[PDB]
Symmetry: C2
Subunit: 56 residues, 2 copies
């Protein structure tokens, strides 16, 4: 449950439904805004498709 990029427990955890992987929200959104793709699989991914995770 670490961010796939930062390697840390996310402050704001989200999941990409394409890679089924956890990210820090802003780090995933940076990739999505810049490329329109999931950074692990290169599949298309929109901001609206990201699943924000409700904290415990």
């Amino acid at each position: 449950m670490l961010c796939a990029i930062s390697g840390k427990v996310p402050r704001r955890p989200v999941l990409s439904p394409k890679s089924r992987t956890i990210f820090e929200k802003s780090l995933l959104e940076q990739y999505v805004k810049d490329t329109g793709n999931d950074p692990i699989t290169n599949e298309p991914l929109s901001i609206e498709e990201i699943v924000e995770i409700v904290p415990s």
Copy 2:
């Protein structure tokens, strides 16, 4: 410190419900869904196949 919404413990095999956008232990959410047909937080219909298994 993402904990299962049922056990309150760090899941060994975390999964996400797309309805509640909430993390659970895989076995616990699967059992809840087998019993009720629903997401435990929102009470909406949920199938086992909709559960997102998170990639380690």
